[PDB]
Design a binder for this molecule. Structure first.
Ligand SMILES: [Zn+2]
Ligand SMILES: [Zn+2]
Ligand SMILES: [Zn+2]
Ligand SMILES: [Zn+2]
Length: 116
């Protein structure tokens, strides 16, 4: 529990450990995952790396029949548009008329072409 766990006091960190030993190793920027052993120059590099080990996708698609899962809410929201058929981003150029499901596709289109 909280009482027994050892919390990290680095700014922005939300990690905790089963022992003071593993907290001390964590403060030396050693990966928390068994068998990895990678060390990092800063605490920011460590936290970013740990995410690569995780296959956790907590957010389930709400569309009945769909078994897809997502790490981030924005990714899930973008995905749901596949089911609804929504194309929110419409090109403003006069003879284009092109639509896009994701903003990154719309941004890529505006960069690739010279469109408003
Ligand atoms: Zn930490
Ligand atoms: Zn690692
Ligand atoms: Zn879905
Ligand atoms: Zn366009």
């Amino acid at each position: 529990e909280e009482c027994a766990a050892y919390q990290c006091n680095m700014e922005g960190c939300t990690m905790s450990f089963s022992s003071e030993k593993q907290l001390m190793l964590h403060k030396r920027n050693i990966c928390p995952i068994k068998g990895c052993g990678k060390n990092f120059f800063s605490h920011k590099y460590l936290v970013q790396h740990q995410r690569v080990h995780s296959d956790d996708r907590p957010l389930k698609c709400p569309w009945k029949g769909c078994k897809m899962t997502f790490k981030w809410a924005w990714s899930r929201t973008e995905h749901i548009r596949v089911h609804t058929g929504a194309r929110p981003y419409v090109c403003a150029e006069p003879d284009c008329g092109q639509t896009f499901r994701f903003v990154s596709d719309f941004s890529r289109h505006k960069r690739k072409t010279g469109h408003s």
